Symmetry: C2
Amino acid sequence: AQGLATILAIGTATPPNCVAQADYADYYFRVTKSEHMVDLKEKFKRICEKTAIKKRYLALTEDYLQENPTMCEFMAPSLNARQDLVVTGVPMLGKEAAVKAIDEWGLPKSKITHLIFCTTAGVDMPGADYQLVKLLGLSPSVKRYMLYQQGCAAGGTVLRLAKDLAENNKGSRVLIVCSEITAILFHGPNENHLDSLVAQALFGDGAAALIVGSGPHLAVERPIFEIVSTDQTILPDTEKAMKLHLREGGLTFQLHRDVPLMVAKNIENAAEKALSPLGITDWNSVFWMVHPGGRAILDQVERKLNLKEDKLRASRHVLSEYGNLISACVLFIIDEVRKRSMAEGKSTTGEGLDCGVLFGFGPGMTVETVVLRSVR
Amino acid sequence: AQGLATILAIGTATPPNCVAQADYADYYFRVTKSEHMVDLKEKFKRICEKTAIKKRYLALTEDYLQENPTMCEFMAPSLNARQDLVVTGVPMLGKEAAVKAIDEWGLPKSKITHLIFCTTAGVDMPGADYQLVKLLGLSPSVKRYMLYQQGCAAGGTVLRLAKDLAENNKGSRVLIVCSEITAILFHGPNENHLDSLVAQALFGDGAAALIVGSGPHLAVERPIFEIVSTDQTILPDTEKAMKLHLREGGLTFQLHRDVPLMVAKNIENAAEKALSPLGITDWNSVFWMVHPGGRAILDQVERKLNLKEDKLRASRHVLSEYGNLISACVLFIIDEVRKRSMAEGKSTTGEGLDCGVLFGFGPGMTVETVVLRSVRVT
């Protein structure tokens, strides 16, 4: 195609089940039948406090756990129950976000030439990509990219892949869907093996959908951000950061307690590598979209880049309103800065600034760094 | 980038443990202690016979089996055991193939800018892609595409994706690794579960690796094929063709008997969509690499496009020497074709022919159609 890959529409959706973080420990310990673990509950009460999460939407409900109680047992086999939920739920949630993007875009869905489906919740053959084309009625000849088991940096993964798709294929229009349902990693509290206990407080459900294309038809298409550049790098010596295994008992979860420090040690290098080519040295002259793996990661990034204390508001905002949405989370944040900037009357779609940097963090530890150019 | 994405090297690897198909029914029913199922044992021998497969390489060993006996159960929880095998084995097998590709390539590892890792066997976080760059010492900043649970058509998927990365990124060099270990799909024999049983006779293990790039440095790099065009379409009313679920008992397998006919029904359209823009109508005027989903799919494609009788010899060869290698299978066949061609002294890398078509067939049912342009041998 001709011109930079451009984001032209963003839609989001969540499961209807809302849970206030302020009530989560009571529910969670009630529901897993673990109220005798009071010290455990207190700790968990405290972790929920420090998440800086106000609420989450969860496809997993209390009825489901009743019917599939082994999901609450720590090492009881429960994958089949989890698959039953997410193999269906993930593409349905994704279709919901996609309808909104397609509607915002406004053009006929027959013009969608490429589908990128991304999730960290379950797998199946045929894929969630197949079900989405069916659900949506996309062309049977749409080219698909089925991204399974992707994790927390994959919101940047889908833009990096979309960029090359859109730019190498003249007139191509790419639909991106990241759809995450955290039922895959639900686990009861375990004194021993506390590992997945912070996961219970952290992750929320949702899907984000994007339309991306080169050479927008400016009469009927409305550019939101240009994708300037994408980088992916493995942080040295951080393999221990995060590990998640798909086992009989579900999606396992180990999170190293110094992950934020691993981000603090490497994040200026990623910033410099991305902005230096553009001639930018002042981090505060650009807008930031940071995957909120946790509050501490946001604070470290803010510290190490010496950000003004309002710089990560949009990121802190979707952590607050939704929790960690894994691969869909930075796409929610893109929507958030673009909507807030229109609401506030900014001169551009990127908080009135011309350039921005999105970060995704995942296993590896992997950093994805995408440079976005605002519009107007 | 430059002109067309171009395949510049290819390497293949397999587990060292080989099994003669002729002996597989005996091996199989004896390790699963399913000896009393003489009838079904007879049934399975007939299936092994008709596969047109002579041997398969398998990472799954009988002592791993007798060590993790639930894998043998005709359904019991065994995913942990299978994962334990494949989470390590898939990237190690893939590393083995990538070293060979990079060795053929001859350029520094450091020049590899993108990695596509593709498999159908197991998943892990960090992925097989991470493991691979660590095994090979690839650049930490290599751009990765981790293709999990992909299936029998993904040999075309990786080519289709490699094509756009290589063509949109000036001077980029893409490493493609497809590595498959059929242990996720191993199951003991059981009465009315026959598609699963047919799979115990069909799939073999292996990894293929390719170096893909645009604007080859013609001094040091040697083009093998150019990737001309790429299509993916789902075949109408064939959702039931194949279904595989990853569950506590491992990966399920369900295959409809009419899959060969479903391909037959749709294949000439695929060929026509791919070759008409090139002004080609003569199917015998081109080379064909057909994913040996089974011998019957090869027969059917051959019959439907009315190819001469040894048109599919290369696809038949690797099915015979390796079994169905899921996503890497057609990449083995690309190597077979170019290696047999250079050896017979063909004037091109594509059986002496100029253009060729490769077909991947997967769940959907999906067909991936990629057009390859051969290169002249001297």
